[PDB]
Amino acid sequence: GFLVAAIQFPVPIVNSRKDIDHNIESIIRTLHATKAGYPGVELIIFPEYSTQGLNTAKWLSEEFLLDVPGKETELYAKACKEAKVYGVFSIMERNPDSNKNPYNTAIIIDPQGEIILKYRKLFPWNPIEPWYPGDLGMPVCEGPGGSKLAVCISHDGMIPELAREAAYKGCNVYIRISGYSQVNDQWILTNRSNAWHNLMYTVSVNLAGYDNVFYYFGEGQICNFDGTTLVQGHRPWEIVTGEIYPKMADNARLSWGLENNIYNLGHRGGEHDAGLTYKDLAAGKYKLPWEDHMKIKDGSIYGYPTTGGRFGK
Amino acid sequence: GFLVAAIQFPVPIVNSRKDIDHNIESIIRTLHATKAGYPGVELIIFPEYSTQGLNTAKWLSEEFLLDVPGKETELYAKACKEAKVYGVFSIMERNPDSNKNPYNTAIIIDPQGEIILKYRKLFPWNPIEPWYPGDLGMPVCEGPGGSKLAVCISHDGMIPELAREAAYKGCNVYIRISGYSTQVNDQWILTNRSNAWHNLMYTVSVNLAGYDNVFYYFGEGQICNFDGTTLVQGHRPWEIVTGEIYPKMADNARLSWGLENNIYNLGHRGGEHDAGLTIKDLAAGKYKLPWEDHMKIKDGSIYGYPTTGGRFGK
Amino acid sequence: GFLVAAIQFPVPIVNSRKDIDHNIESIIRTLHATKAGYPGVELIIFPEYSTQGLNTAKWLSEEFLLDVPGKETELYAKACKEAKVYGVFSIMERNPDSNKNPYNTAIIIDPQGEIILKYRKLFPWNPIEPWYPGDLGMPVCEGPGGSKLAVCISHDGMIPELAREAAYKGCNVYIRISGYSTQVNDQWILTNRSNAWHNLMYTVSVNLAGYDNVFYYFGEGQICNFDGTTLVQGHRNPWEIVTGEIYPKMADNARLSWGLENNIYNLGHRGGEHDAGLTIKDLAAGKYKLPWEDHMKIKDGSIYGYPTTGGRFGK
């Protein structure tokens, strides 16, 4: 298998582009330091917002936005190539369509300096997050030591359907960059269930904040394919490492019978209809019975406009 | 709200209809005694296989099968009306289609001795369970103290999409009657908690106890808050798990929460309604995993079950 | 110090005096077997209702009641003398005043065969328990290994003022015999710890097992340090023994030496303001009264079918 490393990267305050650049260099220095301290490490992970922070007053402005790929991702690509590692990074990506809000984007770069995975946050943390829903789906790429990497972003991990989708497309190591975190206990909970439901590893790491900007939030969790937590970090700069053996997870999906739950879902050769009776979500008409009387269905509580479009530029 | 009671019933060792009748009367006596011990109790839950046991050599035979409803469920209904409680029971149900295998069925009976919910196990615990996949979907019913009750069966609770479905239909107290375990033990506690948190509903779950000729111990009755917090936990046989459930707070959270209102976020990424979902594999009945060709267990032959389907084990 | 044993005793169903006699001999059998297994043990503890069970339809009748002292307590005394141990026993005691309901009584017998502590449950578990509120206060007696023993009964241990009371009179080893539960499981572990830490004393606590005609799975069994740290934890099975060594002198030293965390002293010496403020001493004057008493749903035993006019009933 392989050795993974997740950094409970702290996020200081961000007030300008030079602070974003300062973060970028800091992330790169960390990546080289981590490789020097753990020579065997092949995958190094940074949390969501590590590049840009969470300045809600400026985080939609063009100054605070980057392109993917771009000169900043190329610096990360440069860093991965000479350190000879896979790296996971966070970019608040400028939308190619200027009338839409920016995306919340995660990328995985290989030891050759190539972006091999690009994911845009499918489930933004509403109502606080103004990011446009991702349009690239849940992609999977080839990782080190026989791993099939997929990455989700913070809130995404609370949606078991998304963990199912990654594993459906072949993922055996599910990465979750963050983060939150009023949700601390449920973050531990979902990292374990995401693992167990789909017979895959989960490697997760949260940022470290309060305002949310005091250097203490992220946990850093490694879960076995059976849901058992192998490594647990506390609440900045805390590094969570551990050996991952994706093959044991792959074998479990092949040999297991009784609790092969991911297979059971489609083969109750079993009944191919799960009920799904007379599948709303698939047709885009997912509707809860209590939607009419809900209090929060827009971002007005956080000061955002309700008509949508581009804002905060 | 209301007070619930989950009984970690000892798995019976069953060799005939006579033993099945002994179990029913034992369940009935336990129900009346739980009411006597807890006068404010409104929901008494029994686990999967508490009526018929797990005699794998015999459990497909007609002698070991009951109709739902039938003479046996009416005896449960009488007890419920006499005790004035909601009751959750388990019956291995004779398939009205004599060319198909029996269902694994759960029923909820109200304080007036009427069946208000009937659920057929959607996900049998393959490959050990030869039950036919349920055809009734996931139903929801009115319960005590403003609750909307739904019930799943052991293995069913390992499927997050099913807990989503119950909630999608208005369920705020998710019931899991179970006949595991000692190999899925830690994950049984995990899923009971995740099923709650994912959908902002209470989960009330209980497993049986003695599944051999004896071995009277599995249990682990569990009550979880809508935020995934475990309120009450059993260890162990005849262990009773009681707690007060306040379903109104779960309903209010669904209405008032924003940041962690995940059950809403799923359909409103008014958000992008398509979750990608880039069509509908499961919905179109073509759910297929890339590693399916090399899987070892895709039938029941490992437990000696025929692989051509139809009715077997009479 | 000394070695302690707490038995998560299973009480079968009691339907007659014969069954009570069977329980007595079984408890005696258990005491001698525990001494043989643990030759160093000096304190053996049996839970509430271990003698007479919890037949709520017959437990108020004369057949189900004993005298303290009586012919049965002297069987316990004989066993304790033969084995040379301190023993803790439970007896539902017939009230000498025949116009009143019976007490829920606990006793401690010394290795000399004498009753050295007699306690009547001060706080019955209302509304399910019909026992008369005990009139003997909270007594403290001398024990083995420098220990000063006091015993409370199940529901008693949920009252922090009672744990205070025992310690206030010298107790360093707070014993809790119990017949719960499965609705107070977590809170039983909680209060066994808090009762210890509040007063800088050890707590040794044990609960029963069964009632429903074949069952027996209720108890826990717990030994806590004087700072509230749990040392030994029994599970929930019948016959489960909880053993551990107790060093009572260390608890006493903590009460003498400690300054910052000496909370039992701080209560009366805020040489400090002697008035705790405490600015209506209601409980002391017997006029303790909660603001929501008018609107309470359960203030008698009618929910369980008990007469609401007091006196003697259930004979």
Place this chain on the structure above:
Amino acid sequence: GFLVAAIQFPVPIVNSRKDIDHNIESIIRTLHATKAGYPGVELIIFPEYSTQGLNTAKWLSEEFLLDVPGKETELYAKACKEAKVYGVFSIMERNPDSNKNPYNTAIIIDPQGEIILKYRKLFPWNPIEPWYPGDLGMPVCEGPGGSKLAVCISHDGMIPELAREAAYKGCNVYIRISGYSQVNDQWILTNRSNAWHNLMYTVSVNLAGYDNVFYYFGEGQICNFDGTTLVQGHNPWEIVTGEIYPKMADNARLSWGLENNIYNLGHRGGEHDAGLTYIKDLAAGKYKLPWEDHMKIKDGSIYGYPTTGGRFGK
């Protein structure tokens, strides 16, 4: 109910009055930031010593002392008014009587800038604390979402009698602001026991540590009325948040029979004398432990304090 917030404020090192004003502005800037991050929060709580720190060499000097009310409490009140929240603050209060040491004082301010609760620490953390014993008893006030708030200060929370007193006067949400903590495990323990003993919620938060470098000294906790821990802080600006439902603690006190312990204490309609028929000492002011004669610490001379009383450390 209502959404509460507890901030594990970092202990400031204080050397002058400027540093105190620096803290006040920091607390005010933290309060407005919490409201912005959680638009639904109605109660933001700060720990003991958040305003003035723990400079034991200077914490008795008039420079380090404020009045309640004063211009500093009016700054907190102005902040509460502008943010529209209830706020809990700490003030080392100058004693209006000149022959007595300063008080350790907590105040609750409502969304209109009114101080609706003033409490002086009844049990100072002796022998390290020189504060005069409080004289205002244990007050209770109305809060948001139908709550009845009461506050104790750090050491006060180790005294169950005080938790009992708060509840006795109607409190359903017991607040504990703190500047501990060599008592870490017993902090979590007593936070749960205070809740359960009295059938009320507890919300507790501790300051974060002294010495110009150390800034991380304790936890932060929310407990349900049954003692169950709901949220747990687990270092400086950690924010502990959770939704509180006080009416269902009220309901428990009205509904419960078996474990309605707070009622059982007075009605063992029960015997009114707790018996307590031969240890009724604290009422008359005659509390006396049998071992008081041999105690090693009964004054503050271990930390350099004088032993004859009066005003000192000026």
Place this chain on the structure above:
Amino acid sequence: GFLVAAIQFPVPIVNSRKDIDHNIESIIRTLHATKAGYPGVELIIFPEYSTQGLNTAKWLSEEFLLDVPGKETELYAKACKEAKVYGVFSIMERNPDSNKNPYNTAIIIDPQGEIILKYRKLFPWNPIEPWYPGDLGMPVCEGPGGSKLAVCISHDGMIPELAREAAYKGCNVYIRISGYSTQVNDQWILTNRSNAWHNLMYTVSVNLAGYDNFYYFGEGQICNFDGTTLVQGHRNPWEIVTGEIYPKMADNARLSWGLENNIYNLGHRGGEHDAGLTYIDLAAGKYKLPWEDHMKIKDGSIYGYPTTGGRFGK
């Protein structure tokens, strides 16, 4: 790897040989039933004293002693061959030297029905156990799924030097069959975890649950090679702890690891080969604690045993 099962077997009182023979059939009935319940199981593990119990008044008598191998071990071997599993059994063994006390013995049998490992308890649980110190050392044998099996007996597991020894001979799966406890309960879980981590091997442990006529002493445990508990008996008689063991992962770590390869570090601190401890004395048979003169228990007189050695209790 392979699937392992550990049964928290109960043993009732034993009063005669007819009870011992009843135990053997029960163990054999359980073995076939476990294989039927778990078709993939390759290792079935029974606890210490599961064959003969702990009648301390008769366990030294000829009536209570068996030969290893012998007619009774043949019954175990036949059962293993029929079920096609490895089996681990417990036998109190008549000493081939009739002038010395019996041994406390454990055996492993392969699916072909052959004894491939025999071990005699090196550290009897003094002073309560009268068994003779084992003379066969700590053996290792080949098991299923690339495992190198070794077995220790209850009290043997509290001695870290023995766990080191097994691994030193190749063991990657350290089995602990046990007949404690409830006075060493917490430390049993501890040592199983440390025994694994110290030597980078799996530990599979199980205790008897019954020896009195309290059938609840067991606590089956599977630990990962880094100390992590994977499955925990939790607990009761007839409770079966199951889990998949992947021995090659432990072997790889011993080959690949650098920073925590402690088993290698011990002898190569190419390192200083002399550890510089020399209590390692023990090698020369001079192990001597500085406080032996003042110890209370150095014989079995407290349990009534004579202090002259030789054969007794016959």
Place this chain on the structure above:
Amino acid sequence: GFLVAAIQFPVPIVNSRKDIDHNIESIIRTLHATKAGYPGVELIIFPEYSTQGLNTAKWLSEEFLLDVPGKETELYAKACKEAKVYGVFSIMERNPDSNKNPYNTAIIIDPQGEIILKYRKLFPWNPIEPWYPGDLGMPVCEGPGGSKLAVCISHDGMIPELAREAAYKGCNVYIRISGYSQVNDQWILTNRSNAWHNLMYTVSVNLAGYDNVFYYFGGQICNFDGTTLVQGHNPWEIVTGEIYPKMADNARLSWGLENNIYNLGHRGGEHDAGTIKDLAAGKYKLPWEDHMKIKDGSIYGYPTTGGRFGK
């Protein structure tokens, strides 16, 4: 008994002798301040590398090494005498043999300023640590409140034989100063087992930080039966508790069924344990040594021939 204090000391970054001097004064100020806040404390413990840090580029250099004893140890000694406490300190010690690498040394200083214990780490954390294997064995001294103190250093604590060795020589309070920590869980695990195996207390504390900003690297007091009594959760976090070594002494004298340390040599029992033997003769050899990937320090860029390097 006595009161103990363990400081989860943060180590900032060390780039010069000046920084080391700053570390020394910080420790001294912390020692006096802990005495002030806890006037009843008699043992204050500082973690491994608190004096010199972990600059792996320079930590073998002559600038970064001190002599034991030296004027830096006499600064600590002066502080212990003025505060009247026992102190435990870390020193990376220049090897008197200039052809060999420096030791990783721990010292205990009493209230008289006397170093009563000097321990050179027997088990350097290979392959990352280049320190020379200690030659002073596992020493034991007389501590406060009836204690017999021994000190092991970080990685030493994963070796139960060493914990056995300390106890064998009388130790009833086993101190572990540490600069880990990827092994956070196993650290808590071994602190408990070291205690239970030998019927002695264990007081342990790990360092905190080095990454130019990072400080939060993993403080534990365990009872003689292995039960954790106090557990730290910060850089600068102080772990305190009262230790009663007499109760540990008594258990060793009193216990029968539970006396494992005695049983090891008295299976009067069989004195042969039943071949540790290879280790005594210096021939400890694992069957899988030939296929191991890490038997030197080339993974971290160290030379593989021994001698003096990094100076």
